Amino acid sequence: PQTPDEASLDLAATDGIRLGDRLRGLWDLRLVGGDAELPGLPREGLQLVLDVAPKGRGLIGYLDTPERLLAAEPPRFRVLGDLLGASSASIRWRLVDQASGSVAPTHDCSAVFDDGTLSGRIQRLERSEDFRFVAVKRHFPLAHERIVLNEKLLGWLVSPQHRLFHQLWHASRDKWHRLSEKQRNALRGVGWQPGPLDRERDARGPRKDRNASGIDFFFMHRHMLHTARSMQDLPSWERLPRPVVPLEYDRPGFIRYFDNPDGFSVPPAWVAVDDDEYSEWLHGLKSAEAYHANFLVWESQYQDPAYLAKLTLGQFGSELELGMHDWLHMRWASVTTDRFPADFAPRWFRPENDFLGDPFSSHVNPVFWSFHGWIDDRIEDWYRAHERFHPGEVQRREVEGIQWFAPGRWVEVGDPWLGPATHGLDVETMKLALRIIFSRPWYARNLKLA
Amino acid sequence: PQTPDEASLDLAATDGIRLGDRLRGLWDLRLVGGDAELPGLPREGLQLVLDVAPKGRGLIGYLDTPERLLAAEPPRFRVLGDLLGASSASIRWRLVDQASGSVAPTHDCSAVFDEVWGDGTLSGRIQRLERSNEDFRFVAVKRHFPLAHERIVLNEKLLGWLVSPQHRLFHQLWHASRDKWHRLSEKQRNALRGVGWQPGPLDRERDARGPRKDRNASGIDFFFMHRHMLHTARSMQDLPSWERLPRPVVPLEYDRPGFIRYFDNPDGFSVPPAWVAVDDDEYSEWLHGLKSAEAYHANFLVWESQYQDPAYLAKLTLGQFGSELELGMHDWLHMRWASVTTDRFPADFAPRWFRPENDFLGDPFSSHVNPVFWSFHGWIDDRIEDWYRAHERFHPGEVQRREVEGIQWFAPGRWVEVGDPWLGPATHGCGLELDVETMKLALRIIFSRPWYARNLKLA
Numbered sequence: 023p024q025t026p027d028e029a030s031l032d033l034a035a036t037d038g039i040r041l042g043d044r045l046r047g048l049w050d051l052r053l054v055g056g057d058a059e060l061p062g063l064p065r066e067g068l069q070l071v072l073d074v075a076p077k078g079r080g081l082i083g084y085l086d087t088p089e090r091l092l093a094a095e096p097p098r099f100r101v102l103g104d105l106l107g108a109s110s111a112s113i114r115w116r117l118v119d120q121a122s123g124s125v126a127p128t129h130d131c132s133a134v135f136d137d138g139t140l141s142g143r144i145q146r147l148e149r150s151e152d153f154r155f156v157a158v159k160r161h162f163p164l165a166h167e168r169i170v171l172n173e174k175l176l177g178w179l180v181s182p183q184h185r186l187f188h189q190l191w192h193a194s195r196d197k198w199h200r201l202s203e204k205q206r207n208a209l210r211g212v213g214w215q216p217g218p219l220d221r222e223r224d225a226r227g228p229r230k231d232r233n234a235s236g237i238d239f240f241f242m243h244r245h246m247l248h249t250a251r252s253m254q255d256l257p258s259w260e261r262l263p264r265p266v267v268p269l270e271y272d273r274p275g276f277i278r279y280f281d282n283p284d285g286f287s288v289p290p291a292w293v294a295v296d297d298d299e300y301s302e303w304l305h306g307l308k309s310a311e312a313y314h315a316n317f318l319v320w321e322s323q324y325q326d327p328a329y330l331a332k333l334t335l336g337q338f339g340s341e342l343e344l345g346m347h348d349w350l351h352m353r354w355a356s357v358t359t360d361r362f363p364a365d366f367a368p369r370w371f372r373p374e375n376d377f378l379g380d381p382f383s384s385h386v387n388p389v390f391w392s393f394h395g396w397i398d399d400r401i402e403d404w405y406r407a408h409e410r411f412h413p414g415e416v417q418r419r420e421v422e423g424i425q426w427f428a429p430g431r432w433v434e435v436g437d438p439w440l441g442p443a444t445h446g447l448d449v450e451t452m453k454l455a456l457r458i459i460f461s462r463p464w465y466a467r468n469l470k471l472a
Numbered sequence: 473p474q475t476p477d478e479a480s481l482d483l484a485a486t487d488g489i490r491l492g493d494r495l496r497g498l499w500d501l502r503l504v505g506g507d508a509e510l511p512g513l514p515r516e517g518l519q520l521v522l523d524v525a526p527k528g529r530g531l532i533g534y535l536d537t538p539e540r541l542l543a544a545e546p547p548r549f550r551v552l553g554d555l556l557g558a559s560s561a562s563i564r565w566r567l568v569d570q571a572s573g574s575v576a577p578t579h580d581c582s583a584v585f586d587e588v589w590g591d592g593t594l595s596g597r598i599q600r601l602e603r604s605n606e607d608f609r610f611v612a613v614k615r616h617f618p619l620a621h622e623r624i625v626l627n628e629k630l631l632g633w634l635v636s637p638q639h640r641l642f643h644q645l646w647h648a649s650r651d652k653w654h655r656l657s658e659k660q661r662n663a664l665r666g667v668g669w670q671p672g673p674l675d676r677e678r679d680a681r682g683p684r685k686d687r688n689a690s691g692i693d694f695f696f697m698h699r700h701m702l703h704t705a706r707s708m709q710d711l712p713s714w715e716r717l718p719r720p721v722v723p724l725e726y727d728r729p730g731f732i733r734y735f736d737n738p739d740g741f742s743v744p745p746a747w748v749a750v751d752d753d754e755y756s757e758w759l760h761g762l763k764s765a766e767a768y769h770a771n772f773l774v775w776e777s778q779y780q781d782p783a784y785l786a787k788l789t790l791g792q793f794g795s796e797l798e799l800g801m802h803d804w805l806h807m808r809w810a811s812v813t814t815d816r817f818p819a820d821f822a823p824r825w826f827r828p829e830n831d832f833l834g835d836p837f838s839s840h841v842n843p844v845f846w847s848f849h850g851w852i853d854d855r856i857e858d859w860y861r862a863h864e865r866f867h868p869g870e871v872q873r874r875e876v877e878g879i880q881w882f883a884p885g886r887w888v889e890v891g892d893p894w895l896g897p898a899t900h901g902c903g904l905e906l907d908v909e910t911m912k913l914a915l916r917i918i919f920s921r922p923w924y925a926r927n928l929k930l931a
């Protein structure tokens with residue numbers, strides 16, 4: 023059986039990528055057995071930090087005390103491994119004693135899986151032993167464990183009135199293009215048609231860019247921000263959070279990231295069982311490649327005077343909702359089996375349900391307010407932009423107590439849709455409208471691979 | 473026409489990868505025109521640092537004095553742009569005034585890119601966004617990527633040995649004979665047996681690239697000759713091994729001073745950026761790949777691991793390891809640290825090709841002249857030690873040390889297929905210092921993309 027003639031670029035395939043994702047991050051570690059000792063280190067309260075490049079086959083990391091992995095000087099032990107033919111059943115790496123002035127490995131580690139638990143064996147290489155270890159991968163903390171929404175704001179956000187309102191508001195305009203004339207007349211009869219009667223602004227139909235649906239998108243969220251901000255200080259993201267710094271370049275910055283210290287760390291992609299298309303899609307929008315290919319591209323375009331100045335507010339809103347907005351939700355989504363849109367079991371109403379993937383829960387997420395603020399601030403760049411390329415042709419005006427814009431060349435309509443209040447407990451009306459409409463999570467429904 | 477229904481992962485295609493490559497790095501910059509001034513900044517002696525992710529469509533960077541771009545505190549101006557619809561005709565970015573405590577753009581920049589025939593030219597007009605007709609222009613020359621010899625200096629004595637016709641022709645011919653052996657006619661082979669240039673023992677030659685290359689002990693010849701070349705080289709200059717393979721460049725986003733340094737190649741070990749070969753997209757994609765950070769993480773780090781893993785090494789005879797390391801990592805280490813040089817043909821012996829300038833890592837006629845060659849061959853050599861230790865662990869005594877042709881080596885055994893390593897005619901010549909004209913002749917018998925590009929495959 024002949025050996026290879028040459029090397030080829032050998033990027034991790036699915037199994038390597040997912041195994042790397044299981045490994046990547048910070049692990050609590052203890053040594054076990056009568057022979058189990060590393061020189062100058064306790065047997066317990068150790069930590070193991072591991073990293074693998076998005077398509078890496080190589081495994082790096084460090085093994086020291088928690089205060090030392092966070093410290094400036096080199097950790098006592100460095101991990102060097104690789105993941106060739108490695109899986110849940112065999113994971114091998116060497117340790118290097120960085121205090122010994124040699125990179126020659128001092129230990130051969132092997133580990134097995136039984137957010138994940140490694141049971142492992144170490145062999146001293148100076149020997150030709152009962153030396154095991156147990157490693158428990160640390161919790162990736164949820165935004166709610168790090169940005170506290172106060173009792174007043176949270177009470178409003180989790181209320182049935184508000185959960186159902188946010189869902190129905192999205193659902194009516196999202197589905198309108200596909201709804202039968204019988205469905206449309208039902209919604210009209212209970213005041214939940216998306217915008218002006220017999221002239222509705224479907225968000226997802228063939229004319230979505232030109233019908234002014236985009237203005238509804240910007241306005242409703244500006245209105246929601248205005249209310250939320252009256253009860254609590256919720257500053258906008260100035261800049262989109264950068265992907266995690268690789269372990270090789272800033273070991274302490276890499277480790278802090280996994281503590282989600284500001285609530286803005288990207289929660290790791292989860293494997294959706296029996297849906298590989300969903301699994302790849304999610305993996306990609308949560309990736310560093312996606313930041314540089316899509317997210318940074320939006321950050322630049324939507325602060326480019328020449329780019330914004332080519333668009334009506336309607337066109338701008340439609341573009342930003344259809345692209346950046348579903349991607350902001352799933353990129354910052356931590357894990358929920360997804361609630362069916364017309365299921366009003368009491369448990370779905372509890373403060374714990376803050377799933378970014380569903381407008382029923384999305385607004386309960388602290389991170390929702392940070393990127394909706396960034397979105398809302400882009401409306402000011404678009405106005406500055408028209409004020410540059412088209413002075414006077416866009417005019418300010420107050421609408422429903424909210425600073426806004428009068429109709430014009432660049433503002434297709436002046437009656438923005440907030441549901442029945444602008445264009446018409448009875449929480450029951452909204453249940454009935456959701457049921458009429460409905461007869462993978464919400465922000466995963468339009469997924470497309472490249 | 474209909475707007476998209478959804479976003480999709482929109483990775484850079486070839487033209488956008490290549491543009492980002494032309495943009496990436498440190499540029500010397502001047503402002504020019506009547507109204508051309510940036511707050512707190514001189515008109516001349518400015519630098520512009522750009523980065524784009526390997527498949528990134530976004531453009532980031534900074535504009536301040538050279539001292540400030542290396543400083544801890546934030547640069548005065550920050551670049552944000554994207555390359556959608558961009559080309560050599562139109563690159564656009566906004567500037568952000570980091571002293572302003574606003575991220576709203578203060579300036580709109582429009583640029584044209586020219587190849588040179590510095591390392592490219594960026595030029596065009598800047599508009600103050602505060603203003604509701606100004607002469608505001610700039611020119612940015614990209615700084616040259618410094619070559620390894622401009623950084624690590626091989627001393628007069630050593631340089632003389634390396635550039636000599638004797639040594640260049642030895643190196644090319646030693647590879648060519650064993651690399652081509654399995655393709656050569658019986659007539660070409662007898663001719664080479666004729667001048668004592670057959671690869672190893674007469675009528676039992678160890679071809680390096682034939683179907684039994686892993687099991688015919690060719691591996692030992694590979695390891696032994698480089699070890700022999702290392703001992704000689706090291707007698708004339710301290711040439712320490714790499715302990716660890718250099719990491720890819722730290723992205724600008726995470727370490728701005730580290731990114732800028734990398735492009736000065738300050739230790740001679742920075743990865744010279746890829747060049748486009750005309751009419752050869754297969755070769756251009758290949759070279760781009762093995763210079764990529766993906767390659768580091770996909771292949772180089774894996775080799776770094778495998779060849780220091782006792783359990784991996786202990787499965788292998790010295791010659792299995794030789795064949796395996798040469799055919800994968802060795803040819804890839806050359807071309808990853810290869811800087812730009814038409815490439816010299818094997819049979820062309822023009823004086824100009826002998827100049828010390830000719831240190832191209834892609835051709836054994838020149839590779840040994842590159843300083844970086846001695847760093848990675850020292851590293852290869854050092855893994856022979858990991859391989860010995862590995863056998864002392866799993867097979868104690870089953871491998872024994874032994875001095876051979878003056879060199880600390882290894883006695884033939886279960887795990888050392890042969891005791892007669894091939895240095896050339898000195899050790900195996902049975903024909904009918906080395907003669908230069910005999911070497912030229914041998915190369916003509918064998919030769920009836922650069923050398924280390926000849927066995928490229930894509931995935």
Ligand SMILES: NC(=S)Nc1ccccc1
Pocket residue numbers: 036039040043291292293294298301302303304305
């Ligand atoms: N960890 C995840 S979400 N898995 C995955 C699935 C397909 C492709 C790449 C990665």
Ligand SMILES: NC(=S)Nc1ccccc1
Pocket residue numbers: 486489490493746747748749753756757759760
């Ligand atoms: N700069 C180079 S070598 N070009 C290139 C070619 C194909 C794919 C990616 C990049």
Ligand SMILES: [Cu+2]
Pocket residue numbers: 347351384394
């Ligand atoms: Cu939203």
Ligand SMILES: [Cu+2]
Pocket residue numbers: 188192381
């Ligand atoms: Cu919403």
Ligand SMILES: [Cu+2]
Pocket residue numbers: 802839
């Ligand atoms: Cu070589």
Ligand SMILES: [Cu+2]
Pocket residue numbers: 643647836
């Ligand atoms: Cu060589």
